Amino acid sequence: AKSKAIPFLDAPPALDGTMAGDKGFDPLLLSNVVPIQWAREAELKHARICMLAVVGWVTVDLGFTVPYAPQVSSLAAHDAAVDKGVFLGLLIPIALVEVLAGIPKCFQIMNEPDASPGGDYKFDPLGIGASAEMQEKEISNGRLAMLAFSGIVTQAALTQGPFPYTYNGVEDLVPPMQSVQGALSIL
Amino acid sequence: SKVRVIVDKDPVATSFEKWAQPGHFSRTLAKGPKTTTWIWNLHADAHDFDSQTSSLEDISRKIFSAHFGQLAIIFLWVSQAYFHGARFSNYSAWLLNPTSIKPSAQVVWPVVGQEILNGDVGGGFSGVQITSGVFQMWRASGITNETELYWTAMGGLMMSALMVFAGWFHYHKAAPKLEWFQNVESMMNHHLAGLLGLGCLSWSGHQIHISLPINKLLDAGVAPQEIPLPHELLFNQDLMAQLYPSFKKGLLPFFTLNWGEYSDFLTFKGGLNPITGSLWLSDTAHHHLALAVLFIFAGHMYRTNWGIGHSMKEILEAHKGPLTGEGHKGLYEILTTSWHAQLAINLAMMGSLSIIVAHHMYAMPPYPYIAVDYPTQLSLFTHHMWIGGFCVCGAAAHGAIFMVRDYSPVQSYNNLLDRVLRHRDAIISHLNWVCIFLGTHSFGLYIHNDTMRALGRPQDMFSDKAIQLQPIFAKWVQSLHTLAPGNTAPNSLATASYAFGGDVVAVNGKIAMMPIQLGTADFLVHHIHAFTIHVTVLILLKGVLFARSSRLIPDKANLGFRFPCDGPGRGGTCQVSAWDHIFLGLFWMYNCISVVIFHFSWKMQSDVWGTISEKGKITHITGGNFANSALTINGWLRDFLWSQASQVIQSYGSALSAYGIIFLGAHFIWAFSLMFLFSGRGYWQELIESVVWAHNKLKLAPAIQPRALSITQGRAVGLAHYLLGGIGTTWSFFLARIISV
Amino acid sequence: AAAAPATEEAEEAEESLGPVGALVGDVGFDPLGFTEILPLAWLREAEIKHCRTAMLATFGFAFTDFWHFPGFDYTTLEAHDAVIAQGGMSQLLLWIGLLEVFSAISIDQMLRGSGREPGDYGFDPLGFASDPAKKADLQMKELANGRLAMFAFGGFVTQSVLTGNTFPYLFDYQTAGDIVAIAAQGASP
Amino acid sequence: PIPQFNPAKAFIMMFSNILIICTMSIQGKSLARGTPHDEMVESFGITWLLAGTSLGHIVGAGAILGCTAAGFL
Amino acid sequence: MSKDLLKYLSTAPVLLTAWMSLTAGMIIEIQRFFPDSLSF
Ligand code: CLA
Ligand code: CLA
Ligand code: CLA
Ligand code: CLA
Numbered sequence A: 001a002k003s004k005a006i007p008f009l010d011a012p013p014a015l016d017g018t019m020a021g022d023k024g025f026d027p028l029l030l031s032n033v034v035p036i037q038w039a040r041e042a043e044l045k046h047a048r049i050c051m052l053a054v055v056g057w058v059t060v061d062l063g064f065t066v067p068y069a070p071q072v073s074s075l076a077a078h079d080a081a082v083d084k085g086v087f088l089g090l091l092i093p094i095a096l097v098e099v100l101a102g103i104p105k106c107f108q109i110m111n112e113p114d115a116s117p118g119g120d121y122k123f124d125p126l127g128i129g130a131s132a133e134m135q136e137k138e139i140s141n142g143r144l145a146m147l148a149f150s151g152i153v154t155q156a157a158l159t160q161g162p163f164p165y166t167y168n169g170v171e172d173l174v175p176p177m178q179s180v181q182g183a184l185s186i187l
Numbered sequence B: 001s002k003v004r005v006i007v008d009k010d011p012v013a014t015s016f017e018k019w020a021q022p023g024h025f026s027r028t029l030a031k032g033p034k035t036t037t038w039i040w041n042l043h044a045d046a047h048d049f050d051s052q053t054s055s056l057e058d059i060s061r062k063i064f065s066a067h068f069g070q071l072a073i074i075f076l077w078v079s080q081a082y083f084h085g086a087r088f089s090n091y092s093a094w095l096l097n098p099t100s101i102k103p104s105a106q107v108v109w110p111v112v113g114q115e116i117l118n119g120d121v122g123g124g125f126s127g128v129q130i131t132s133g134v135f136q137m138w139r140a141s142g143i144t145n146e147t148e149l150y151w152t153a154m155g156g157l158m159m160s161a162l163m164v165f166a167g168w169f170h171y172h173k174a175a176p177k178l179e180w181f182q183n184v185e186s187m188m189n190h191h192l193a194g195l196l197g198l199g200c201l202s203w204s205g206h207q208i209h210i211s212l213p214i215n216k217l218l219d220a221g222v223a224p225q226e227i228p229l230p231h232e233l234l235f236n237q238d239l240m241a242q243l244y245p246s247f248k249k250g251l252l253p254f255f256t257l258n259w260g261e262y263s264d265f266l267t268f269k270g271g272l273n274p275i276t277g278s279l280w281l282s283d284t285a286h287h288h289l290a291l292a293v294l295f296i297f298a299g300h301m302y303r304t305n306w307g308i309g310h311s312m313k314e315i316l317e318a319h320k321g322p323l324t325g326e327g328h329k330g331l332y333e334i335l336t337t338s339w340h341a342q343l344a345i346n347l348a349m350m351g352s353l354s355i356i357v358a359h360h361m362y363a364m365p366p367y368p369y370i371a372v373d374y375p376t377q378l379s380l381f382t383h384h385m386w387i388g389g390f391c392v393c394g395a396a397a398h399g400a401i402f403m404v405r406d407y408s409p410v411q412s413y414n415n416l417l418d419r420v421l422r423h424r425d426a427i428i429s430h431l432n433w434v435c436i437f438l439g440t441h442s443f444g445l446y447i448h449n450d451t452m453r454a455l456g457r458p459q460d461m462f463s464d465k466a467i468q469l470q471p472i473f474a475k476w477v478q479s480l481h482t483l484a485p486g487n488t489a490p491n492s493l494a495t496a497s498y499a500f501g502g503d504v505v506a507v508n509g510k511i512a513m514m515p516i517q518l519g520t521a522d523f524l525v526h527h528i529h530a531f532t533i534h535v536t537v538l539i540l541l542k543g544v545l546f547a548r549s550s551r552l553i554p555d556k557a558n559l560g561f562r563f564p565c566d567g568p569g570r571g572g573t574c575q576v577s578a579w580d581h582i583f584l585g586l587f588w589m590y591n592c593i594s595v596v597i598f599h600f601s602w603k604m605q606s607d608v609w610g611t612i613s614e615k616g617k618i619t620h621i622t623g624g625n626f627a628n629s630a631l632t633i634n635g636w637l638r639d640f641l642w643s644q645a646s647q648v649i650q651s652y653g654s655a656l657s658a659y660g661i662i663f664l665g666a667h668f669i670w671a672f673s674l675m676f677l678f679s680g681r682g683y684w685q686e687l688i689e690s691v692v693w694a695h696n697k698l699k700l701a702p703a704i705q706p707r708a709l710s711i712t713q714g715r716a717v718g719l720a721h722y723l724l725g726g727i728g729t730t731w732s733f734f735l736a737r738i739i740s741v
Numbered sequence C: 001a002a003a004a005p006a007t008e009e010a011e012e013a014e015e016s017l018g019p020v021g022a023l024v025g026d027v028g029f030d031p032l033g034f035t036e037i038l039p040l041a042w043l044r045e046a047e048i049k050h051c052r053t054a055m056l057a058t059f060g061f062a063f064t065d066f067w068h069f070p071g072f073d074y075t076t077l078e079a080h081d082a083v084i085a086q087g088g089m090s091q092l093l094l095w096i097g098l099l100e101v102f103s104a105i106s107i108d109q110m111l112r113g114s115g116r117e118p119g120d121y122g123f124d125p126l127g128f129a130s131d132p133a134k135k136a137d138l139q140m141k142e143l144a145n146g147r148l149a150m151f152a153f154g155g156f157v158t159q160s161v162l163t164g165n166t167f168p169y170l171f172d173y174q175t176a177g178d179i180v181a182i183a184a185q186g187a188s189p
Numbered sequence D: 001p002i003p004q005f006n007p008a009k010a011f012i013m014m015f016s017n018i019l020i021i022c023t024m025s026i027q028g029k030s031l032a033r034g035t036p037h038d039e040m041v042e043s044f045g046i047t048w049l050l051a052g053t054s055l056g057h058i059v060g061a062g063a064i065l066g067c068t069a070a071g072f073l
Numbered sequence E: 001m002s003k004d005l006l007k008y009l010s011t012a013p014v015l016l017t018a019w020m021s022l023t024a025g026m027i028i029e030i031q032r033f034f035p036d037s038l039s040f
């Protein structure tokens, strides 16, 4: 039984077919050591934080800014908000949600036999529905947003520049934008 | 997962029912008192959990909950010092001038004329002078404000309440099973990493971010009320970079292994800070970092749930040789099934550690302006000496208790314990010969010096102007330490301590630390120390080894750990128990520690402490008389005791009069001890009978019949009174002497 | 499984909360699990005492911001120290301490299990809840008012010190400006 | 964590990690002792890599700091 | 209080400590109000 992702490594025995997002990708066999619901808790918390972080970073960089906030880029927004003295106030909703939800949920994941799964906070106010197709969409967007925020921060620190976070803008993304004469000179 | 948490739920109901039934823990005392011996037996057997229950699990649970209660008491004791510094002290006025203001954090109530004890400690304050050194300890942490002391006291009260709750919780709600306590590898890993290494790491972090900038600004001359608050220094790379120009690079050189960029605040310069006469705090933070890394590294050694790690059973059983038979086999079961063995090891380690602390904190003053505070240095040295001596006696006591109770011959056949027990006469004989040789030599040189000086023959003495006894090995070691920076400590600026030779360190006239010269008197008193330590070892080791049996009494283990005798038979079997050996060895511990602290006090007052004037003129407290007067017993009697008791006997009518009162009272208690120590039970029982006749005549006979104290209790009372009187007399004498000069 | 109907990613596996509906307003809100280590009756008594104290405190804070007795010419934030120096707070402490010593004896008898429900002293002279059908409803109203008054008093003292104004406890730009402005805002108010 | 543009610093730490991992020993089992890779994956799992990289990082830190004090990096 | 906590408070050491504290307090307050009395 080989894994679906790695065709030459054996399949991890803790990932059968359930738990949406299962591509059979687990080298290091971390599912054997870390409990699987705890790992889903951590993955989905990271996913949601990274989604909100990507959208906030891009939104502040594009120019959207609420009144009385410092009109700076998202790279310097952290230091500007700390210097203004209001960025500590964001901790109180974070402290409320994280303590009073995550701490009992983490303890019940580790201790209680029957408990809700990792991302299952049962939030759902509108009632869209937690279908198996929607969970796959959530976790795919979350993994994409994690890699995206990593890349966005690492490139924005290197360039200190505008939204594309490359050294020459979107022209680095599209090589036909940049001097196709040299390409034509060899045809 | 072998290492797991297994816990019983609600084992013991919380009720005020056995509170009203004293003596409930034991079978004999629970039936009610008939004589006035049940009271003393109730007090003696309160903490002897091994005689109350035969289950090791319940004993371990009681031990754990009692540890929590003890930690609560210690947290309250930390909170008292912080609160008295916050509200009842002159700590701010001491911060503004820590060389002329005497620390004081204890004020008395005027009711009976005792308001004379509120002496003029300086700074517009009246109170009792403090020799604890808490002021310098707070200054080393950057606690320049009096609000932080108050909040530290409040946090200490909160932590004490937490420990009280935890102690109730782990005995009445969630008491761990026996398999939880026996995870000694897990306990060892968790202590070595999480307690020691993480405490060192967190304290180094606090030092680097708070105490280094605040103490640097304080030594720069900035007044404490214009110094940035520690929370303003914690998150300000600009201000720290102004102070230490390495925070500009941030945490990047730490992760790139370019640790040489952090040499601004992590140094190995050594020596003493000239401004404060103490160790450099950068050296202290670097020291704590090295310790944190070492301890966290050491905490990864023993096997837990995962396959890596060591088993301590396999390490011990592999260490065996030809001359020792089976080696360390069976010691793992001994130390995982008995608490008394763990006490016997841990008390010895803690006493030796306290003695090491005493020897290290005087030659290496670690707190600012603590070296020029002579009462603090003397009090800390003598304190840690007495604590170490008491703990090292208790180690032998619990080794004897283990040997009487928890020893098993089937478990410990032919291992190290068995081989030690099979030749104990050779050990005790050779240690006896060493004690006699050391005593005859070390004391007879003093007596010979007394005789030569009394006969008018100073040229025949054992002195530096006569037949010399130079400690050549100690001088060679001192010369090796003085030449260490550059040669064997190449990245070092100064020596480890100036006691090994070097330069005199002075802070505002007073001497912080200067080289200590060793002569023939130092040789003589070091041999006295070795002899006293050897005799204490002889008594305690003879008590431990002969705890089970001897040639005199073959069945001593069947009589118990403590028992008065085995009758007047065999010529007399008085004080044969191992308890009586601990009782006899406590006196010799007292003698040894008294001689050690007398040596320290006289040598430091004579050759180190003093003043410096223009052109480096050194004037010590006593005048350098230790070299020629510490060679005779008359010299000790006349020049130390008689000459330095003048401060304690003339303290009446001044702020030090409580020291004279305690001097007289401790003499009274010490003499009161000999009443119990010399007399015997039967005389007191007959006198009690004569008193009971008068009581019976006046219809006043108590139903709880009055009895004399038991023989073991009489010895214990006499020993406790002797120790209290001696330690009180020395305490009052030292404090009244060193405060007033 | 019986999930808590106030968190519901967590169960009522905090079974120290007891049966559902044993107390009024029981929505199973115990995330940190204080009921595991403490009795429920003592926590309920503390809660109801806090509710009533905070209700009286909120009303007194606002009233002292509006009116005061003659001779008590002190503001609300300085009434504490001024009346301590005057001596009235000693009288308050003495009489409240007498009533609270009686309450201490009451809690001691209740925890040993005499008859008492927590927070019930029988003090209903006007007979509002002498009908047993209206007892269970007025308890919830008392609770909700007490919780809201706890939060209200905390906000009252913190905004009164933070800004330095009377009963609105608002900044100058929130009363002497425009909060429902839709124009392009500046960079300060 | 990575060095500031130093390729020599990277080689010391990676070589130390590889050398430690190949020269480990748990319960008498070791790649150098002639004991196969697949069952050491089976018997230990990620504990093998974690312990090997921890000891390799300690050894590499010591070697890097020593060669920096002498002169190289 | 309780029927068995009061019995614990009725023990000899607790009662001795409480009564000695009361006596010491009474004598100390007498010395505070009527100090330095040699004669009657
Ligand atoms: C990972 C998530 C994340 C993080 C860490 C940040 C971080 C940041 N964002 Mg941001 N953002 C995000 C997601 C995120 N964003 C998303 C998803 C969006 C798009 C919707 C935005 C849109 C956005 C804008 C438009 C702006 C920021 C800004 C900022 C900066 C300052 C924020 C601040 O001071 O908060 C302060 C927090 C508060 C004022 C609210 C605290 C709540 C108070 C204390 C009350 C607490 C509740 C109380 C207990 C109950 C109610 C009480 C009352 C009603 C009675 C900071 C760097 C600002 C900035 O400076 O950029 C330059 C800015 O203008 N962000
Ligand atoms: C890293 C984990 C850790 C830590 C820190 C400790 C710490 C301690 N254990 Mg312990 N223990 C552990 C794991 C740990 N243990 C494990 C895994 C086992 C089972 C094998 C045991 C079994 C055990 C027994 C059987 C006993 C102890 C005892 C003790 C205390 C020794 C007394 C002392 O040095 O006072 C130092 C005092 C302090 C450091 C004060 C702080 C006290 C708190 C509780 C320490 C932890 C605080 C917290 C985790 C840190 C928060 C950081 C935050 C501020 C950011 C000490 C508090 C003994 C004791 O005293 O019992 C009460 C005792 O009898 N332990
Ligand atoms: C880690 C410290 C530690 C611990 C946990 C123990 C624990 C124990 N010891 Mg032990 N011991 C210790 C240190 C320790 N000891 C030291 C340091 C010594 C050397 C002095 C001894 C010497 C010793 C002997 C000789 C004996 C024990 C015994 C015992 C056991 C019962 C104790 C009991 O019920 O006493 C109950 C507690 C008391 C009666 C209180 C004693 C109060 C003292 C004597 C007075 C203190 C005066 C105070 C400091 C100043 C007063 C000032 C004045 C003005 C009022 C128990 C297992 C006995 C036993 O049978 O073991 C199985 C026993 O015979 N121990
Ligand atoms: C000042 C009082 C004093 C003196 C001199 C001694 C002397 C001694 N005690 Mg000791 N002891 C004392 C008080 C004293 N004790 C008290 C108060 C207690 C009660 C707690 C004890 C409890 C006690 C115990 C429990 C033990 C001792 C032991 C010893 C001996 C140690 C071996 C040694 O070096 O002997 C050498 C002699 C001396 C140190 C004293 C004389 C030195 C002279 C000046 C030099 C040599 C003189 C020479 C022999 C004779 C020449 C003159 C002659 C021809 C006229 C030694 C005989 C231990 C022992 O005997 O084991 C070996 C032992 O186990 N004692």
Ligand code: CLA
Residues within 6 Å of the ligand: C086, C087, C088, C089, C091, C092, C095, C096
């Ligand atoms: C049981 C009755 C009683 C009595 C005799 C007192 C006595 C006193 N209170 Mg008082 N107090 C009480 C109950 C009582 N308190 C209760 C239950 C509370 C609420 C918990 C308070 C709250 C309180 C505060 C907040 C203050 C006092 C103050 C005072 C002092 C006023 C000094 C002065 O100049 O008088 C002023 C005299 C008058 C204004 C004249 C009119 C007063 C009339 C004659 C009182 C009526 C009789 C009275 C109710 C006695 C009971 C009779 C009985 C039949 C019920 C005085 C020591 C004040 C203080 O300490 O200042 C020094 C202060 O500020 N009290």
Ligand SMILES: CC(=O)O[C@H]1CC(C)(C)C(=C=C/C(C)=C/C=C/C(C)=C/C=C/C=C(C)/C=C/C=C(\C)C(=O)C[C@@]23O[C@]2(C)C[C@@H](O)CC3(C)C)[C@](C)(O)C1
Residues within 6 Å of the ligand: A051, A052, A054, A055, A123, A124, A125, A126, A127, A128, A129, A141, A142, A144, A145, A147, A148, A149, A151, A152, A155, A163, A164, A165, A166
């Ligand atoms: C159900 C119900 O009842 O109520 C609902 C109501 C409500 C509020 C709707 C709910 C919700 C859901 C919410 C709030 C969902 C928000 C989800 C969010 C915010 C999802 C962002 C993803 C961002 C991504 C994928 C970024 C990719 C970025 C990628 C892939 C890049 O490559 C970027 C790139 O930069 C790199 C990395 C390098 C650059 O050189 C080049 C570019 C620029 C191309 C709740 C909580 O469910 C409750």
Ligand SMILES: CC1=C(C/C=C(\C)CCC[C@H](C)CCC[C@H](C)CCCC(C)C)C(=O)c2ccccc2C1=O
Residues within 6 Å of the ligand: B675, B676, B677, B679, B680, B681, B684, B707, B708, B709, B710, B711, B713, B714, B715
């Ligand atoms: C005096 C004495 C007694 C008699 C001692 C007894 C009966 C102790 C009495 C204890 C009392 C009752 C405790 C309280 C003491 C006083 C009532 C309070 C004094 C308080 C002062 C601080 C003022 C012995 O039983 C004994 C036994 C073995 C060796 C030596 C001796 C010994 O020397």
